[PDB]
Scaffold this active site. Structure first.
Site, mmCIF file in Angstrom:
data_model
loop_
_atom_site.group_PDB
_atom_site.id
_atom_site.type_symbol
_atom_site.label_atom_id
_atom_site.label_comp_id
_atom_site.label_asym_id
_atom_site.label_seq_id
_atom_site.Cartn_x
_atom_site.Cartn_y
_atom_site.Cartn_z
ATOM 1 C CD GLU A 1 -2.733 1.468 0.103
ATOM 2 O OE1 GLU A 1 -3.329 0.507 -0.429
ATOM 3 O OE2 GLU A 1 -2.843 2.645 -0.309
ATOM 4 C CG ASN B 1 -0.161 5.940 -1.402
ATOM 5 O OD1 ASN B 1 -0.464 4.854 -0.907
ATOM 6 N ND2 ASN B 1 -1.040 6.878 -1.623
ATOM 7 C CB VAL C 1 -9.501 11.297 5.826
ATOM 8 C CG1 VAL C 1 -10.854 11.176 5.133
ATOM 9 C CG2 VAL C 1 -9.503 12.493 6.781
ATOM 10 N N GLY D 1 -6.875 -0.455 -3.980
ATOM 11 C CA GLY D 1 -6.185 0.569 -3.196
ATOM 12 C C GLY D 1 -6.972 1.029 -1.975
ATOM 13 C CB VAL D 2 -7.130 -0.233 1.517
ATOM 14 C CG1 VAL D 2 -7.685 -1.534 0.948
ATOM 15 C CG2 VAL D 2 -5.685 -0.419 1.991
ATOM 16 C CB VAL E 1 -0.972 5.669 2.982
ATOM 17 C CG1 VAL E 1 -1.335 7.136 3.131
ATOM 18 C CG2 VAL E 1 0.275 5.344 3.779
ATOM 19 C CB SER E 2 -5.768 6.615 6.137
ATOM 20 O OG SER E 2 -6.755 5.907 5.409
HETATM 21 O O1 LIG Z 1 7.535 7.764 -0.991
HETATM 22 C C1 LIG Z 1 6.303 7.795 -0.424
HETATM 23 C C2 LIG Z 1 6.014 7.018 0.694
HETATM 24 C C3 LIG Z 1 4.750 7.049 1.252
HETATM 25 C C4 LIG Z 1 3.765 7.841 0.697
HETATM 26 S S1 LIG Z 1 2.073 7.961 1.200
HETATM 27 C C5 LIG Z 1 1.987 9.509 2.063
HETATM 28 C C6 LIG Z 1 3.111 10.106 2.623
HETATM 29 C C7 LIG Z 1 2.971 11.185 3.480
HETATM 30 C C8 LIG Z 1 1.709 11.682 3.765
HETATM 31 O O2 LIG Z 1 1.508 12.756 4.563
HETATM 32 C C9 LIG Z 1 0.592 11.082 3.215
HETATM 33 C C10 LIG Z 1 0.733 9.993 2.381
HETATM 34 C C11 LIG Z 1 4.057 8.632 -0.410
HETATM 35 C C12 LIG Z 1 5.321 8.605 -0.972
#
Ligand SMILES: Oc1ccc(Sc2ccc(O)cc2)cc1
Ligand SMILES: Nc1nc2ccccc2[nH]1
Length: 186
Positions: free
Chosen positions: A27, A31, A82, A85-86, A88-89
């Site tokens: 996940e 991102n 919030v 693809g589920v 990163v929250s």
């Molecule tokens: O290399 C990367 C690693 C994780 C993410 S996800 C994300 C990161 C911060 C944030 O505040 C919200 C989502 C994105 C890029």
């Protein structure tokens, strides 16, 4: 995020046989790949740390940092807190700790979460020429049982598939436990 904490298995997959544990990394990687695609160099690095946390970083533009007009906290926090693809929250909710760093518009921004709870607002900690994002997370051992350690080959297998599909994105995998490394680039 209480809906996720209530039934982690329904969001992340099995929390006892290792499938959910590894899905946590996948996940975050999705991102990171999206971010790396919008920048010039297009590289991500996935690192397995000796304390069985994992970090994922990209050299893209940086996750946006401005205050969200409606939510009233940084856009970075909105995405972390919030349900969307589920998302990163989900990873954040099921991590006993998650640390992030965003390099954007000349500034280093940092924030720490514990079990999905922000410890302080996103904060500028320094200046930089670089851009990109990094997340390091420590899966919750209250949630993840039996299989609690990351298997290198499960990560390597998926990252290989991703490298073919996202041609031109460089994916590095490093295991700091034993020094193993791979570089997937199509
Ligand atoms: O290399 C990367 C690693 C994780 C993410 S996800 C994300 C990161 C911060 C944030 O505040 C919200 C989502 C994105 C890029
Ligand atoms: N140990 C622990 N587990 C938690 C779950 C949700 C919020 C805070 C928490 N602290």
């Amino acid at each position: 995020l209480d809906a996720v904490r209530k039934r982690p298995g329904m969001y992340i997959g099995d929390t006892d046989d290792g499938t959910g544990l590894h899905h946590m990394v996948f996940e975050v990687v999705d991102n990171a790949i999206d971010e790396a695609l919008a920048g010039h160099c297009k590289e991500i690095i996935v690192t397995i740390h000796a304390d069985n946390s994992v970090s994922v970083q990209d050299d893209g533009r940086g996750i946006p940092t401005g205050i969200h007009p409606e939510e009233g906290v940084s856009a970075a926090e909105v995405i972390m807190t919030v349900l969307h693809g589920v998302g990163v929250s989900v990873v954040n909710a099921l991590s006993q700790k998650l640390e992030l760093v965003i390099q954007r518009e000349g500034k280093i921004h940092r924030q720490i979460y514990e079990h999905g709870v922000p410890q302080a607002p996103l904060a500028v900690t320094g200046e930089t020429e670089k851009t990109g994002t990094m997340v390091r997370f420590w899966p919750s051992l209250e949630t993840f049982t039996n299989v609690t350690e990351f298997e290198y080959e499960i990560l390597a297998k998926r990252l290989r598939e991703l490298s073919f599909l996202n041609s031109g994105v460089s994916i590095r995998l490093r295991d700091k436990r034993d020094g193993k490394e791979d570089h997937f680039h199509y």
